[PDB]
C-alpha cells in the first residue's frame, strides 16, 4: 500500500485513522516513536506557533498596549524579549505557563499509560466543536491545518526579519 503524498513509498501504518494523516512520514518516525507523543507534540507546537505568529505580527503593526513601560519603547517584535525579560513581563507569564505545562505533563503520562485522554485534549471549550463526529473531526483538521501553516509562518517571519531587518511586509 503506497502513501497518498509519496506514491512511490510504502504507507505509514501507525498513523492511519488520525486527523491530518496525508500519508507523509518519509523518515518513518511514527514506526519507532509512540504515536500519541508525536500527535501531542504536533498539536502543541502548532498552537504555540499560531499565537507566536500573531503576536509577532501584531506588535510589528504597532499594537503596543497602554500604558507601556518606558523600556519597551522603540522595540520591534524582534529585539523585545530582552527588554521585556528585564521589566518582568516574561517572567510573570512564564510562571503561569509553567504551571499549566506541569499539570499537562501529568496528563501526558496518563495518556501514554492508557487513561483515555486523547492526545491534545484538555477539555476546553468543547462546546463549539459541534455535535456530529464528522463536524468535530472537521474542526480538528481545521485547527491542525492552521497550526501547520502557523509553524512555517513563524519561522519565516523571525528568520527573514532578523536577517534583513525588515518590517511587516516580509517581516
Amino acid at each position: 500500500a503506497k502513501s497518498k503524498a509519496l506514491p512511490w513509498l510504502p504507507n505509514p501504518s501507525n498513523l492511519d485513522g488520525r486527523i491530518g494523516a496525508n500519508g507523509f512520514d518519509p523518515l518513518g518516525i511514527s514506526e519507532y516513536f509512540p504515536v500519541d507523543y508525536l500527535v501531542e507534540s504536533e498539536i502543541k507546537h502548532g498552537r504555540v506557533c499560531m499565537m507566536a505568529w500573531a503576536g509577532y505580527v501584531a506588535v510589528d503593526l504597532g499594537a503596543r498596549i497602554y500604558p507601556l513601560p518606558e523600556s519597551m519603547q522603540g522595540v520591534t517584535s524582534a529585539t523585545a524579549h530582552d527588554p521585556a525579560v528585564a521589566f518582568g513581563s516574561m517572567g510573570n507569564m512564564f510562571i503561569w505557563i509553567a504551571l499549566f505545562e506541569m499539570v499537562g505533563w501529568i496528563g501526558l503520562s496518563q495518556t501514554l499509560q492508557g487513561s483515555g485522554r486523547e492526545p491534545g485534549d484538555f477539555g476546553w471549550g468543547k462546546q463549539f466543536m459541534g455535535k456530529t463526529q464528522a463536524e468535530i473531526d472537521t474542526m480538528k483538521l481545521k485547527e491542525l491545518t492552521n497550526g501547520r501553516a502557523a509553524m512555517l509562518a513563524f519561522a519565516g517571519v523571525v528568520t527573514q526579519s532578523v536577517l534583513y531587518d525588515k518590517g511587516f511586509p516580509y517581516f
Binding site: 519507532y32 516513536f33 509512540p34
Partner: protein, 89 residues
C-alpha cells in the same frame, strides 16, 4: 522476561523505541554521534591551548558540551545496531 540465551540478545532489551529501528539507521546515527563528539573535543582543545583569552573559563561552550555527550550515545547506538542486525531487523 529480559533473560536471554544464545549468541545475541532479543530486541526487547533495546527499549520501547530502538527495538523497532532498523540496523542501518542506528549505524548511521552512531557514526554521526561519534563524529560530533570528536569534533567537539578537537575544537575545545584549541581553545584550551590558545594563548590567554580563556580566562574565567571562556573555553567552555554550551554547544561543545552537548556535542561531547554524543560519545556515550555512539557506544550505545553502535551496540544496538549489532543487536538489531543479528535479530534480523
Amino acid at each position: 522476561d529480559m533473560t536471554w540465551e544464545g549468541e545475541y540478545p532479543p530486541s526487547k532489551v533495546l527499549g520501547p523505541i530502538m527495538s523497532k529501528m532498523p540496523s542501518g539507521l542506528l549505524a548511521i546515527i552512531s557514526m554521526a554521534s561519534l563524529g560530533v563528539c570528536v569534533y567537539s573535543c578537537v575544537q575545545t582543545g584549541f581553545l584550551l591551548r590558545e594563548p590567554g583569552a580563556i580566562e574565567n573559563g571562556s573555553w567552555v561552550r554550551w554547544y561543545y558540551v552537548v556535542e561531547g555527550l554524543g560519545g556515550p550515545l555512539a557506544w550505545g547506538t553502535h551496540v544496538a545496531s549489532w543487536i538489531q542486525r543479528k535479530n534480523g531487523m
